[model samples]
Target chain A: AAPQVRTSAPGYYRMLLGDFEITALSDGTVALPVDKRLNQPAPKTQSALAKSFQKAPLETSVTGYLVNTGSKLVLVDTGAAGLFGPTLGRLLANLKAAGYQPEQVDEIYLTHMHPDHVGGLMVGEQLAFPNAVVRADQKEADFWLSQTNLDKAPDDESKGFFKGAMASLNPYVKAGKFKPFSGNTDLVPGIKALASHGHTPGHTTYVVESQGQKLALLGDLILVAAVQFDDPSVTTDLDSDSKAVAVERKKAFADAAKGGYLIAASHLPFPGIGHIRAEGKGYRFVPVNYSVVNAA
Target chain B: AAPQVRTSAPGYYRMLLGDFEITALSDGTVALPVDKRLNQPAPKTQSALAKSFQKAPLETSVTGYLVNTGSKLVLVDTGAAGLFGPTLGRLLANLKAAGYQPEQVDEIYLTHMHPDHVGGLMVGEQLAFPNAVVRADQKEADFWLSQTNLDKAPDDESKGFFKGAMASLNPYVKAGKFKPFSGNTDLVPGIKALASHGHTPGHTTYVVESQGQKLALLGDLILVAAVQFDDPSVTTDLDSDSKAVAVERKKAFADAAKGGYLIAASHLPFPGIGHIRAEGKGYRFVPVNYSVVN
Candidate 1:
């Protein structure tokens, strides 16, 4: 008799977006009690989850996107390196499984300076992507990588954010590979950064396009899928400014729905590529049809 | 610079369905021109596919479910093997990729005796599962395996169906490995066969339940997911009796929706597991939320 493997398939889904190759890599998942974390009435969030056949303490997936443009290899976000928990820190192995090595990544464009987004930059004391130039918004670089900000941070928990940012980003900074771009700058041929700063002081979203097809890499814009897609106004307590992030969330959903472009999120689901449709009062997620063939 | 892999991830998705561990192995995809294949008007099928962001000649997935009931190992269907084109015949490799050899399969259950369903029983005259007992409805074996039926077949194309079935199943039948069962029978603990005959003389569906959770393996009951979910009345040209199959599909769907059980199809998207939600005049398919923590 055969014993159950009790494991999942490798966490990487690949597709072709026109001329560009998009590989969605799964970092791992951590359970988040959204009812306790969301800035909303507990009952409202709980009911929404029930409608979606999910319960509280939902196992939320954390994913990273890799873009290949024939000449450039760009990684959107690094998964929570060893910081989150045992369930986290699966990005590197998955990256290798997807037929890529860390050294092959030409550039690492981060959505923000959050630990989950930047944590994979360094493994131990060595640079994980040694040849890659790490890029982020300049304001994001100033706020998270400062020693003075770490001292001024309110509590021990808040100080950990600063420590995580510095520990992950400083090695590259010292190596002269950390380049903080100004807002709304084109990083490479088909990829450009757009300033959408509400989750953090320097939070950014990257718009990747090639051959008339566009895919917006929305980082931490919408964390909770079950409730947030139905009501974009629902904000999470993790956001630096819940009010401001809610407004940005609504705007992002509106534009994606109207423009008919593919949008991938860090926290939506695994391989979170989908089309946002404006329903009666809110939006609906139409996941990209599963296909073995990668042609767009 | 690294070259693009230009390939997909492994074709397997695993999940714990109650106490039973169900592994959905992707047997690969074949493009079906629903516009040409379905009995419905071409324009209607085209519009449905268009709305779903798919075009005509949709690449449909063929999947086999491996159920490990802890006590016994059961495989719902052996994929198209070499009966279909190159895109298909992928079930064996994927089954291995999911970490099981053919010899480990204790039993092979067929939804029908169609070439796509029974064609994997052999590998160039060699039995695919040497130790496994092959079971199917008695009526299906009689209708598909009889030489008299093959001679009386209407057309050359229709005769090919009988030839393919005989080539795949005769070896097992001669070896005394093929066992035909009556209407409804309990094949194993936690798994039972329910006769759902429409697409063939004796097409059957299997129900795998453990604890309180139930998964109905609706084998070819609903083929074109984009249209059939919205309107089960649409029939495919491949059906042996489009009229009868349509009736069974409606009843099967209504029960699954009202009872709130998970249904996996052979032709829905890969790893085709989801719930049926009745919406508007028809039903809406709610695919199981993608979780990498499987």
Candidate 2:
């Protein structure tokens, strides 16, 4: 007999202002192969690297986010969809678990076009967020939508990415519900876009402020919750432009840490909401109280 | 007035397997710091490094384990007791919450002795597990008990570790409840010891089998719940012997993935019970159905 397992999927809720409600919905996690995913070399030859942190090499998993702002429900980024099967692409199920429905969502926001961030856009050939308007940065949409570029993609991984992105977004575009935005723009009433670019050509971040409370919806600014927080300069193999990513990441970390903004990250961990504080020359991610609202 | 924080603390529970029982606890996460934690050269020079995985730097909260096999109840490593405050050290409270008292624990088994792993052993200079016999690998016990080593410690960070370990274990030893064991000894029935000495000098892993079912209690053999499963060779700065840690980790991953045994990891996400499958050179931690044994 199979051992019976019972537990609720992880989730959390918060109120940005008195009236605006925000909830961090966990859509599950995407586990990426360690050797293939990280920019670091083989582990056997990296003993000095291993002793420093006291851990063994392993694959990495990325968590997705669903941000609810009362009347305008928004999903910051979709998690890995078909990549990991049903266990992932759990944004929809997690949303329902958090007292939300797909129809209630008004907007589907893309932090960038990475598959893990946008894969949840479709279910088979159908739009996952059927009723919501899908939006992405112009550069990201163009890069993902070009067939010529897709043909020129370096690896099968990139090729599959091009196909997946097109398939996920096609339904939304065909339905006339897709919109493209450029640079910095007000996404919603109190949500302003901040250019954190370099993760991707048109990668972006959102500053959500309502009733004096603020949160920076940081997209793919860092990875490896532990390594990323402690060592911001160690690059991963996944970034399209590594050098550009480093600069923007540091500035964002410095600004967020020094500026005192509550940071909502795409993959910092489940319900990845925290504050950044300057520990030494770099910065650290200080998770806010797990409670939905920050204690006064 | 402060805004009402709406999030609830993570949830945990315990389950019984015939005469054996297992308690699953939560150790909330610590945020990852990009430069300081990663040992990267510069923040700006490393931004793209951060972007590769779409996460800001942060350390995850750690979790511990406690397994009761009828006659002997074994408590695994404790979590980050002091760092996360009451929110973290609730393992004791959670144990009680699950209807088991501290006195019910007969023996305490350690995975390794990192602050997160051993901090909960003592609560403010008092043995947290007052009624249980504390057991650890002799090599590990000596490392923590060395006076000269403690005296030569670099700074307060290293010094506090010495203080915390001694403070927690001394009382139990004085009370005649602490015992140090060496090499592959069977501390209890149904619990077989497996040598996994890389994260710490004498770090050990255990195989728990009952009624023909087996589960591997992996300590810090792998740290990041996700990363460890993907790349069993990526050494974290936390390991004392990185090379040994890597070899042991690889072996463990292969064994668990191949044997088709249930894997219970100390920090592989919440209720970190999962199945491992060979993927590339690493393995994946697939969380089992939570409803199993509910």
Candidate 3:
């Protein structure tokens, strides 16, 4: 049982979204237990996972999408960083693996200040993207960065999250590089932020449009796609307000499916660009079929 | 507008098949016209392609899978070398990008002798995988490499395929490293060859198994996966026997769906691996959900 060339392939996949060069970089997949996700009996989640050829202790990949709009570079999220565990935190290397330096990034967009979403904002006490401006919703600024919340945190899990967020954001805030946006606004020529908040207070979704083509960079509107797509009512324990999360996800699916716009969700799957089509009462995720975008 | 990092991310993706390591290497994509593939009408193909978010001339990528079964290294298909156009011929470089030297490939198991599948077997006049043993179905070797068939080829289209087969297999034959089997047999540990010959005379499929995990190496079983998955009855003109090709494709979809075995197709998508589920009269493809297979 000895062989060689055992290295895995490079972890980034690319797509030409209109004129934008959108690259989905993998931060590696992390496993979370099925019990954590299912609201019903364990067998429910187990059954669905089995049909999808997956098993309990479900696997989910953390992904960061880099959009090169030719003029500006934007990263959707930095991934779990080292906050979750060693199973994550590969986004930075995967970014450079995609041929871009952190210094080249112009903006870092936060979907919400969850450790997995913003942990890559800093390494130790220094700014991770030295030349970039970090922006998130004002609610995230008020909720996660509040000194009162940190002081009154009830459990170790809560305390760990506040610590990770403050550590990632404090340096950028001190350096005057962290800017809080009030609502939907233009981030770049072809990219706009929408008020998709609810999973956490200020969770925003980015809509990238160019030359009649569009992509919705869904930020956790739908996390476990296998479960959510089949039943938008199904959500995990991570949502701050479960109903809002489900409603927004249902809305996102309806809009994308009716319009046939492209979708790139942070939690769906790596390089998760695809279309959401209405099927029965729910939606079906058609991952971007492998093809030549503009190649001949 | 200028992007400093204009080059795309590397095109290789990896998946763990139990203890086996499989890397899907992209050889780049080539364009084909819609009218060239459809049987009924121009608009039918056009309509189907449109809903899938593609337009003609439609694009299909060439991919090669490298499977390391802990002890044996097997390559499923060698992409079009320089035969297609500038858009292709990227597989060799991508293989290196996945961190393997071509000389290390132990076995070259081809699905058929089609140029896009076998052209990468040779680089110029030399063998691409110097230390490898090449195997294919005997029917493919006999039908494709025979002078009688070569002389009777209908057009330059047929003639070109004939020439491509020779330039690829001749050197390996002369070196006594070429082996063609007549039926199903073990190619390597945990890997068995199955006669899936429909796309070509001796097209073959490899089923890799280890520790209860399986992956079917479907070489051109359903080339236009976007159209085929929705309707397996749909096929292209390139299939040697369009009916046989369609029938075989439906069978593959049914078997994979019922068995829930992983599928690795040469033309699905980069990392063209997925599972099939039975739908109405046809089937649906569920692309391998991103996971920590290793």
Candidate 4:
């Protein structure tokens, strides 16, 4: 009898959108006490999780996307690298496993300066993506990279967020490679940044298009799929402006549902590309039919 | 600029079901003219496809489930090994890719003797899984492996079904490894066969349980995820008894939903493991949150 191999498969999934190649790199998953953190009553959260056959301390996936746009390689939202937890920091390894080197990436786009989104920028005092240019919104950089904000931070956890951001991003900034962009600017031929600032001061969503096929890279606009898709009013403690976030998330979901494009969210399960349709009072997430392409 | 890789990831997914290990091996996909073949009117099928952003010649996935129940290695279905189409016979390759050897399989269970479900029983002139015992329903074997049924077949395409079944299964029969069981039988410790026989005579569903978690390997009880989940009455031409099949499909789905067990269907997309919930008129398919197992 073969011994049990107690490990996961390689953490990457690849698909094509028109001519562009999209590889979803899994940064692994961590258990979060979601019911305690969501702004909704704990009973309601617990009830919803029960209906979904899940409970608090939910195992949640942390994912990042790699877009190979024929001419330029762009990465959206690096995963946490040793900054989040032991279960995190798998992005760079998974990126290489997905058949590309970190140096091959031409640009790195940040949806916000959250440690999980920007922490993979450096690998212990060295730029992780050595030859790549890192870009984030000016508002995001100002808030997280400020010593004033760091000093006035509310608690140890909040203070740690500032410290992690600076530690992970300062290497790139010193190399004159961390460039901050203004509102809604084109980063590449097929990709553009859209301001969806709510989860953070400058949280942005990346809109990628190739040959008329569009995908919205929803960065932390949504977090928990189990409860949030049914009730967007449900907010997480991670939200800086819960009211603003609900509006932005609904706007994005409404646009995605009506337009019939693909959506890949940071926390909507691995290879989180799916279709959204307005259902009941909220929306429904329809996963893409899994298939292998160009196989003999 | 980097060139496109132009291929998919390896077609295997693994997860833990209580103490048992379950692996879903993809058999690849092929385009089917489902609109024309469904018993429903073509317009209704077309409209449903449009709502789902799919079209008439729908690309459908054929899949098989392998269960490693600590002491035993059992496979629910052996995918078409060069019997169905070019894209339909990837089960063995994927099985090996998923860190398994065919010879290591302890037993092989057939949901039915359909070519896609049993064709991988052999490779060339040899038994593909040499040391494994092959088992199917006695009724299924009597129908497909019978010369009387083969000669009285309706047409060439249907005739090919029998020919493929016999060619793929007869080697095991001669080797004294093929065994057939009567209705609703237990094959091993944690697995049992439930007769859901309308897709074909003696077509069955395998129920696997471990530590209170259950999984129903619904073999062709329901197909065409695009429309069937919303309306199980939408039967394909493959169903031998459409009315019976509709009843069986609803029964299986209702049971899975009420019991809160996972489902792995033969045609519900690759690694087709998911949960079913009672919705408006029919049911909704909720995919398992994709996760790797330890």
Candidate 5:
């Protein structure tokens, strides 16, 4: 027998949007089993199942984006860290492969307070990006840090959520480098936070406009792109309010399709950037081929 | 301001077709301006134009594939090794990125020899994969190696096609390692050639069957996937026989859709693997989402 070779390729993909350089980092992936299907016996979920037959646990890449606005280095979300095991926790290593040291990240922005998104903020109780200022929605801070929500929850898993938020935030908070902003605000000269709620309180999506081009870094509007892109009414158990989430997902899809904007999502496939076109009863995702962008 | 970051990812995507493992290698990319449209004024070409005004010369990725058939290490096409330019010659690097040195490739199966598919065969007048047994259709060897065609070719840029074919094949030919097979033969245990002529004299496509799953690594069945996908009758200056290419393109689309076999191509988007669905007198290409075939 001949020598065997490695089975897969490295993680990460990059694209240039106007003057900004955006790299989609693969923190690896996590699978959400079919049992998490929302609306339980609802007609819409069944319709989605009929179209593609969701027989297996839905596996999706837990991705994040590194945006170089030229003026500053910003990270949209850290991955699931090690909370989801070895399959994830690849963020730190991939970040290095993408040619950046954590020390150089001038700012870190959170899409929401979900464990997977914020878990990598700290490396076992220490600031992952030691020199950077941290930012999240004021509402994201309020909910994830609330003591009542922590005590009122099921178990340590819920308790861990609150602790995870503070452990990663406390260090920056102590140093006064952590700041929280509410509603629509300019997080940077070109990166603006747009309020997208119901996935969680102040669950936000950032519209990055650089030199007249825009790309949306959506948090968790559509958790499983395969299921949700085909049917916007279908959902998962992760949403805090199903009705509100349904409204937001539909509106977001419409705007991107009409405006012809490239979108990046945390749970879409790796380098999860693509164009959206309105088709059928919903939208179809047409991925941008692996591209090289020159910062002109 | 901080130091500028490289902001991009690696090449190569992996998938499993039954017992076989396939890796799509990025041969980098090149921009082919649109002024090269051939068989001009054909309504299908106009419909192709009107469906989406190409706007400018299109930028596309020239891709290749590495199929591990459990019994052999096979390469589909060699990329345009600087025969085009710097932007188009990264297959060797990407092959390494995919975890196998060129030495381990036991066999190389070419679909056809248009410079982009055959140029990488030689690197500075030496065998790129010194150990692999190289195979192509007999017709391809006869045409590219023929003197009459070389003399008739008007210029070196035109004649470079012949030179490029030999510079890659001569060393192997002398070493007796170059073997050109005739039409529709079993190249290996599970890999079989299916004659798909008209793109070139001996244009070919290979149907890889493993554990009941089949994938066709189409040579140039459809170049410029962005437009050809929405309309197959669209002709390009690259086709040697535009009418034959048109017929073959339509047949390939229907056969792939009805058979439900996944297909890969030399001139589609990167990691060019996808399904074809019948739609409105044409077809649509649905790219396989970034999936990890565990």
Candidate 6:
């Protein structure tokens, strides 16, 4: 049937870390087939058919997180910008719906340099977060900005990546608005970067610890919300290094499930904060109940 | 920053199929990452910034098509079965908003059996289309109904497919309400099956040709709305057979671009009907202007 189209309602789900408030902001979701990975054979069709709830070759969602530390407002990923066109890029809109604005953002902490995480950085070469200091890992900045790497990119898409990255970041650099940081450094009193490099050369996951409560802004260590958590070994082909990607992904799953930290994944379902539990030999992501939060 | 959530007003884009009316229904959209593809490595840190406008990864929206043949109401794939918990599944709500009643549908033509495409088949085991005859390829039926296959599925999650498919289809099957077809057959006067297999073994694209004008319902032939049309050869590992999937995808793209036929892809942006144009060596999906109906 032709889908009935309407604008989605704003989403807000929150959890607490000691006294710190972490809200999962719904920027929206995108659906793509399960075989998005490069090296992995389309998930075996039989297996896909078997997992009817998610259906093999599944369609997944992309989500972002908002941390209101009372004293400072930090957004981990800046959802797709309005420039990519309308279906996505509802971060600023949803944020406003959840009762905040770009001007109120004190710091924009990037888990990695992926577009969905940084796409909203600027409004066409202008900083989207005017009042916030944009921070990213030194390794991520170097790789994305290096002219040498752009020349060595494997294809046109890769080349375009270099061009787009520069376009998105250069405006901030020129305006003296971008700040580069080193590994494992605590940008603030409570937020620290945890090196989780596999999906990218220098991907880092962030840990938000305040008043003894903890939360981790686990970037794209895993994708395909249903499948990734259920089958951690099912590596996506998009990884630059599949083997390493799988290893880190499995470790992240184990760590999150064991550490009891509220985990917020960028690509998990919208408001992607969830707890990990051992299911069979793999793990499952139990999405937190949003009822506890006022906006759910 | 928290998102400012407000659903878009209902949108209807129309095209002329001879004298028949084909309206692309606006099933509200949910946004997520572009790299949500199941098999792709999670968006790498560096490249994710460039490819995704969100500075994270790509976020795609799901859409469906509605074809009106004067007296007959033919609907293609259903929207995500309001399954996105509280976030999505706005198709039915929007359909009602568009002045369409479930009973007005005479035929439910399925593009494939995926949840987003078929989930709306029934609402809690009750057929969503009370008066429509559900139609799909026999091959698709067989694949979905294979008991042995379901039994051998590797995991419980996979096993759920059997249960869900049966739950959705059993009521119709028991009521003798399904009309399964084989190969390329004409369902109505003008709608012909254009077999574009591989995304699913029996997945078929429908061709509505009349009065020198033609339109095709391109099921998951090319999944991603943004990149698939531009790079038909980049088959996501999601296909049953990635190599064959790519071959069929290229053929579908060439056919649409060459024929200059308007196309409606199930997973393209909402009101997913658009035209294809040759760009460099690939193609691009140019959305039809909602106001410029032929």
True contacts kept of each: 0.57, 0.11, 0.48, 0.44, 0.38, 0.00
Ten-residue region with minimum lDDT total, candidate 5 chain B: B47-56
User: Largest lDDT belongs to which candidate?
Assistant: 4
**lDDT tens digits, residue span A1-296, model 5:** 13446465657777877777887888887776654566556554545643442334656788888888888999999987876667787787888888888898998888887778887888876788888898889988888888788878677766787777777677788888889999889988899898888888778898998878889998888777657887788766667788888898898899998888878889887778888888899988767765655334
Highest DockQ against the true fold, candidate: 1
| Per-residue lDDT of model 3, residues B175-203, tens digit only | 99999987788888888898887789899
- Error of model 1, residue A235, in angstroms: 1.0
Model 5: docking quality category: acceptable
| Proportion of the native interface contacts kept in model 1 | 0.57
Candidate 6, A1-296: lDDT as tens digits:
33322333345555666767776776665545666553355555335423422353443455677777667788888877753445557778767766677888888887776666678777765688888887888888898878999999989766766776677777878878788887778877688888787777778888998887677888888776545666677766556667777888888778877776667787765556667766688886655421222231
Q: Could you give candidate 4's per-residue lDDT for residues B1-294 as a string of tens digits?
A: 866565677788898998999988888888889998889999999999877777878888888988999888998898989888798889999888888898889999898888888888878888899999988889888999999899999999889999999998888899899989989998899999999998999898999999998999999997888899999888988888888899999999999989888998988887889899998899888888877676
Stretch of 10 with least lDDT, candidate 2 chain B: B45-54
* DockQ metric for all predictions: 0.56, 0.08, 0.49, 0.54, 0.45, 0.02
| A-chain TM-score, model 5 | 0.92
Rank order (by DockQ, best first): 1, 4, 3, 5, 2, 6
Cα error, candidate 4, residue B147 (Å): 1.5
Native contacts kept (model 6): 0.00
Interface RMSD, Å, model 5 = 3.2
**Docking quality class, candidate 3:** medium
Considering the two chains of model 6, state its CAPRI-style docking category. incorrect
lDDT of 5 by residue, B1-294 (tens): 666665345568888888888888877777765446644554544455433423335667788888888878999998988888877878888888777888888888888877788877778877888889989999988888887888898776768887777777778889988899998899888899888887888888888999999998888998877567776887776677888888888888899888877888987878888878788878877666566554
**lDDT of each residue in A124-193, candidate 3, tens digit only:** 7677899989988899888999989989988888788888889898898999999888788988899888
Candidate 1, after superposition: displacement of residue B260 in Å?
A: 2.5
- Residue-wise C-alpha lDDT for candidate 1, range B21-57, written one tens digit per residue: 8888888888877899888889988988867667888
